[PDB]
A paper describes a structure:
Lipopolysaccharides such as the enterobacterial common antigen are important components of the enterobacterial cell envelope that act as a protective barrier against the environment and are often polymerized by the inner membrane bound Wzy-dependent pathway. By employing cryo-electron microscopy we show that WzzE, the co-polymerase component of this pathway that is responsible for the length modulation of the enterobacterial common antigen, is octameric with alternating up-down conformations of its L4 loops. The alternating up-down nature of these essential loops, located at the top of the periplasmic bell, are modulated by clashing helical faces between adjacent protomers that flank the L4 loops around the octameric periplasmic bell. This alternating arrangement and a highly negatively charged binding face create a dynamic environment in which the polysaccharide chain is extended, and suggest a ratchet-type mechanism for polysaccharide elongation.
The ConSurf analysis also revealed an arginine within α7 (R267) that interacts with the downward facing L4 to be highly conserved. To investigate how robust the alternating conformation of the L4 loops is, we replaced this residue with an alanine and a glutamic acid in two constructs. Although the change of this amino acid is clearly visible in the cryo-EM density map, replacement had little effect on the overall octameric structure of WzzE or the alternating arrangement of the L4 loops. Although there are only small differences between the native WzzE and both R267 variants, these variants do underscore the nature of the alternating loops in WzzE, as both structures of the mutants were solved independently using reference-free ab-initio starting volumes and clearly display the same pattern of alternating L4 loops in their unsymmetrized C1 maps as the native WzzE.
Residue numbers in the entry:
A (entry chain C): 53 to 208
B (entry chain B): 105 to 260
C (entry chain C): 261 to 312
D (entry chain H): 53 to 104
């Protein structure tokens, strides 16, 4: 059947970054107080959306999403080669089209399934999956930067 | 502009209008097809400042009064959504700012208390040393109390 | 001898002298030592067109 | 037979730069007190990925 669904995303709002935003801002403050590095850097929302876009287009993200989606598991015949081929095909089913601001077109993601409800639900779940992965990566980055700053302050 | 060009904005606007409600036939597939058809009836053409042309929006309906009223209502709808989003962003930024300011004030209070405690201890030790050496002359140096903590003994 | 001995004892009791920068750094280190509050499941995107 | 596999990489993160990041940052501070280094210079992870 090969039904298709489309989603268009943008940078998150300040309110949906939870506490993370504030924490990141705090660290930025220190990077301005010592070791001048501001250089009118992109906002926290821009970095979060950059990480989200990186996760959305990632081959590994699509592979790991399909491996646990309960829609791939049903279409498993028990043969390793056939399962690998189907996994590769469904990884190729998800496509990411980056947008450029010159013609006011935003980043889009298209998913292909065998039915319309599947095409909708799987795309929603994949976007949530990529967002969660990006959030986890951002939290790990925040932990690393916080530890480095704490070490530097202790030494000082 | 982002609200104007958004697919979601057009979808909700058409859902909340009587123009779409009166054209519903009760069949879910037909209603969805009609909604999708009318979403494409609103076209946003971004402007170009180089050619001195501004952003425009075109709405297509089945009657001229409908084409006028629906476009006016849709522009108002997009403006209201943009205003709500801007208010949410302002509230989030305000909360972040007040959290940061509260933390800064707490740090300033802690620093002041630490300095005050250090001066307390220095004064107490200087008094004990002066009473040990019977320095009761009440005057040993011309400068005022703004002496270093190590030189506070030069007072009776 | 008396004034010098008193100065020696006072300096021994008081200890090293620190400036305002040291206290500010100490307070900032105290706030850094509590650690970041890692809240998961925060959204890193917003929908301009939701899947349908 | 001629089978083929592909990998796609990007810049590392502060977390898996180990201690190295911190060390490098320290030196960079010593390079901005003296000679001023460069205010707009590539980050530590950028240089690490360039070498990789």
């Amino acid at each position: 059947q090969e039904w298709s669904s489309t989603a268009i995303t943008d940078r998150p709002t300040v309110n949906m970054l939870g506490g993370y935003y504030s924490q990141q801002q705090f660290l930025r403050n220190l990077d301005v107080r010592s070791n001048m590095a501001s250089a009118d850097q992109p906002s926290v929302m821009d970095e979060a959306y950059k990480e989200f876009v990186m996760q959305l287009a990632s081959w590994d993200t699509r592979r790991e999403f399909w491996l646990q989606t309960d829609y791939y598991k049903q279409r498993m015949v028990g043969n390793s080669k056939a399962d690998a081929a189907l996994l590769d095909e469904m990884i190729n089913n998800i496509q990411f089209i980056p947008g450029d601001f010159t013609r006011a077109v935003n980043d889009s993601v298209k998913l292909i399934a065998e039915t319309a409800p599947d095409a909708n639900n799987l795309l929603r779940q994949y976007v949530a999956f990529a967002s969660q992965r990006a959030a986890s990566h951002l939290n790990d980055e925040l932990k690393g930067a916080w530890a480095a700053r704490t070490i530097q302050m202790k030494a000082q | 502009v982002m609200q104007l060009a958004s697919w979601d904005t057009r979808r909700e606007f058409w859902l909340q209008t009587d123009y779409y409600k009166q054209r519903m036939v009760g069949n879910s597939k037909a209603d969805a097809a009609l909604l999708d058809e009318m979403i494409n009836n609103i076209q946003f053409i971004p402007g170009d400042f180089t050619r001195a042309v501004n952003d425009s929006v075109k709405l297509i309906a089945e009657t001229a009064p409908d084409a006028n009223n629906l476009l006016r209502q849709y522009v108002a709808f997009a403006s209201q959504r943009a205003a709500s989003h801007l208010n949410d962003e302002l509230k989030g930024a305000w909360a972040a700012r007040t959290i940061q300011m509260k933390a800064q004030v707490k740090r300033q209070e802690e620093v002041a208390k630490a300095i005050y405690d250090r001066r307390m201890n220095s004064i107490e030790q200087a008094l004990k040393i002066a009473e040990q050496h019977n320095i009761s002359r009440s005057a040993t140096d011309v400068p005022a109390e703004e002496l270093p903590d190590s030189e506070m003994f030069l007072l009776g | 001898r008396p004034m010098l001995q008193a100065e020696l004892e006072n300096l021994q009791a008081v200890g090293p002298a620190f400036d305002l920068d040291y206290d500010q750094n100490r307070a900032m280190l105290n706030t850094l030592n509590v650690g970041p509050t890692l809240d998961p499941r925060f959204q890193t995107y917003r929908y301009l067109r939701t899947p349908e």
